[PDB]
Amino acid sequence: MDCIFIFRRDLRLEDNTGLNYALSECDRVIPVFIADPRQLINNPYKSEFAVSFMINSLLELDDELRKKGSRLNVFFGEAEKVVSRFFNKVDAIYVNEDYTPFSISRDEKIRKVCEENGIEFKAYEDYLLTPKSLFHHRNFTSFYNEVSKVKVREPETMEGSFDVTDSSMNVDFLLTFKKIESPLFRGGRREGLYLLHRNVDFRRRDYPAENNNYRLSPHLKFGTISMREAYYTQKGKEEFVRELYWRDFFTLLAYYNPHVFGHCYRREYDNISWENNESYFEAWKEGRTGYPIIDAGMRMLNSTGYINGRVRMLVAFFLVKVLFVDWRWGERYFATKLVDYDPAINNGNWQWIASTGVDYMFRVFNPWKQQEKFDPEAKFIKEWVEELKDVPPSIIHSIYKTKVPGYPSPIVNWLERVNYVKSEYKNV
Ligand SMILES: Cc1cc2nc3c(=O)[nH]c(=O)nc-3n(C[C@H](O)[C@H](O)[C@H](O)COP(=O)(O)OP(=O)(O)OC[C@H]3O[C@@H](n4cnc5c(N)ncnc54)[C@H](O)[C@@H]3O)c2cc1C
Ligand SMILES: Cc1cc2nc3c(=O)[nH]c(=O)nc-3n(C[C@H](O)[C@H](O)[C@H](O)COP(=O)(O)OP(=O)(O)OC[C@H]3O[C@@H](n4cnc5c(N)ncnc54)[C@H](O)[C@@H]3O)c2cc1C
């Protein structure tokens, strides 16, 4: 048959489930990418960094296609409407299903349009490491132990034929949306594999100053490499593989509990009276809070669109349990900066930290203790907080006692706040 494959979040030609079936089931396959205005224009949850990474990855994907006497066929508009106008005469349409409300309804509409035109619509599982039917767990540890026993499908690629549509635009069109690139990523599968092979001490992955994180999230989220590939390449590293499974967990959690997008996983907490002091929130986004480690984190994130998991949760903790600001505010702000923004993964993590999610205990961290343990030399802090650039570490770790020039002193006492926020939770 003459069919179409629509890329979305699986920006690669290797080990792409839906693409594989498409290549083996039809004679010619037209590789398509649809620039959707609901995602690229006036998206409150849009990240400029994430977009650049996607565009760059889309540019790289286009090269791989040209090396096969084809090219990426680009269209513009809402997915369902695009299919409707341009593909009404194609045989079938292949894709990889996703798990968010937006994605689910978008595919339902494409399905309707497909039935009323005689186009076969085939969606396949690809983003997850495990089959979705296998989910039915309260917490992560329960999930991992049960599902990790299952065998991960091995990467594979089918041979086929890539065709083109003269009408369609080409990747050049997408350059309008690439406005500001992360100095820390370049996108594409080639960079992805390079990162996948750096040998780091994952053991010390908590220390920001060190370089022990693979920085693979954006590549996994946008699919320059498959979940299965990351898995087999690192199969021997238990720590990394278990963390890889956290992606599946949060995705599936959201898939089976759509209400997380807008409400608390544990609904009762939808009654918390967030102080939401717009003033503190503004200080948090600018990294002008009085805590060095928190300031360093936000500042890095702002200019880079990335921060390791340790800083990520310290920052999230501080906004929710110390400045007492609704986690949804932080969720949205992050969605705005993360080069690796993933709706379900971002949501899952925020709720976890705000303890309105999968973690049922009311977890608390000591900013100063934390700061001093994971950045003993204050190297990370000095790298991102301009003003403390020359203050000796010893002082920085106690900067609440002093008051260096140009650096605001703590905007609140975390201890008193955390106690109040908790009482407010128990109150509920
Ligand atoms: C900034 C960005 C732009 C992208 N543009 C395209 C594109 O043009 N074409 C394409 O095929 N794929 C695009 N992608 C890839 C996208 O991840 C896949 O298309 C995916 O299948 C779509 O579902 P999503 O939930 O990730 O949509 P996303 O782009 O995250 O979001 C789509 C819609 O959901 C809203 N939304 C996102 N997060 C939240 C939240 N936490 N709470 C409430 N609402 C939220 C957005 O505002 C928008 O209205 C883009 C991804 C990002 C992060
Ligand atoms: C408040 C908060 C928001 C977050 N938002 C996102 C997000 O929007 N998109 C996203 O991809 N990750 C998010 N995470 C998870 C995690 O921080 C990032 O995946 C990680 O920092 C990416 O950098 P890395 O690849 O170097 O991770 P490293 O530790 O090198 O690699 C570990 C890998 O395991 C997985 N992983 C590790 N921690 C988590 C986690 N907590 N949740 C899910 N998967 C994990 C990822 O594949 C990650 O690449 C968030 C975490 C927190 C606490």
308 Cα to the center of ligand 2, angstroms:
7
Q: Let me know if residue 181 belongs to a domain.
A: no
Same domain for 323 and 364, yes or no, is yes
Specify the pairing of strand 92-96 against strand 73-76: unpaired
Tracing tokens 């090219």 back to the chain, one arrives at 71
Q: Which ligand is nearest to the CA of 192?
A: 2
Q: Is 230 exposed, middle or buried (0-12, 13-18, 19+ CB in 10 A)?
A: buried
Same domain for 267 and 237, yes or no, is no
Same domain for 91 and 67, yes or no, is yes
Same domain for 233 and 281, yes or no, is no
What would the DSSP string read from start to end of 86-116?
H-TT-SEEEEE---SHHHHHHHHHHHHHHHT
Indicate the DSSP class of residue 405.
T
Tally of structural domains, the chain: 3
Same domain for 301 and 199, yes or no, is no
Most informative mutation of 310, 341, 349, 358 for ligand 2 (most atoms within 8 A of CB): 349
Give me the domain span that covers residue 55. 1-126
Same domain for 253 and 290, yes or no, is no
Q: Vertex 53, ends 336 and 340: CA angle to 5°?
A: 50
Same domain for 281 and 421, yes or no, is yes
Q: Let me know if residue 246 belongs to a domain.
A: yes
The CATH number of residue 65's host domain is: 3.40.50.620
Same domain for 237 and 270, yes or no, is no
56 Cα to the center of ligand 2, angstroms:
21
Nearest Cα neighbor of 389 from 296, 324, 321 is: 296
Residues flanking ligand 2, CB < 6 Å:
205, 213-217, 220-221, 243-244, 246-247, 250, 308-309, 312-313, 316, 334, 338, 340-342, 345-346, 349-350, 353
Query: Which method was it determined by?
Result: X-ray
Q: What would the two tokens of residue 122 be?
A: 């085939």
Q: Let me know if residue 274 belongs to a domain.
A: yes
Q: Let me know if residue 165 belongs to a domain.
A: no
Q: Is the CB of 96 under 6 A from ligand 1?
A: no
246 Cα to the center of ligand 2, angstroms:
8
Q: Is the CB of 328 under 6 A from ligand 1?
A: no
Q: Are 169 and 201 in contact (CB under 8 A)?
A: no
Contacts of 390 (CB under 8 A, 6+ apart): none
Q: Is 428 exposed, middle or buried (0-12, 13-18, 19+ CB in 10 A)?
A: exposed
Q: What would the two tokens of residue 234 be?
A: 């690192």
Nearest Cα neighbor of 355 from 411, 278, 254, 424 is: 424
Q: Among 107, 126, 145, give the residue marking a domain's end.
A: 126
Q: Let me know if residue 116 belongs to a domain.
A: yes
Residue type, 268: E
Could you give the CA distance from residue 230 to residue 226 in angstroms, rounded to a whole number?
6
Which residue has its alpha carbon closest to ligand 1 atom 40? Answer: 343
Q: Let me know if residue 160 belongs to a domain.
A: no
Same domain for 407 and 269, yes or no, is yes
Same domain for 252 and 366, yes or no, is no
Alpha helices in 13-100 (DSSP H): 17-25, 37-40, 48-66, 79-86
Q: Among 257, 277, 299, give the residue marking a domain's end.
A: 257
Q: What would the two tokens of residue 175 be?
A: 């350059």
Q: Among 257, 274, 294, give the residue marking a domain's end.
A: 257
Which residue has its alpha carbon closest to ligand 1 atom 1? Answer: 46
Residues closing a segment before a gap in the chain (C–N exceeding 2.5 Å): none
Q: Which ligand is nearest to the CA of 223?
A: 1
The CATH number of residue 303's host domain is: 1.10.579.10
Same domain for 34 and 1, yes or no, is yes
List the end-to-end C-alpha distance of the chain, in Å, as a whole number: 59
Same domain for 231 and 288, yes or no, is no
Q: Which ligand is nearest to the CA of 83?
A: 1
Q: Are 124 and 21 in contact (CB under 8 A)?
A: yes
Residue 123: strand pairing partners? 95
Q: Let me know if residue 63 belongs to a domain.
A: yes
Q: Let me know if residue 105 belongs to a domain.
A: yes
Atom index in ligand 1 nearest the CA of residue 37 equals 8
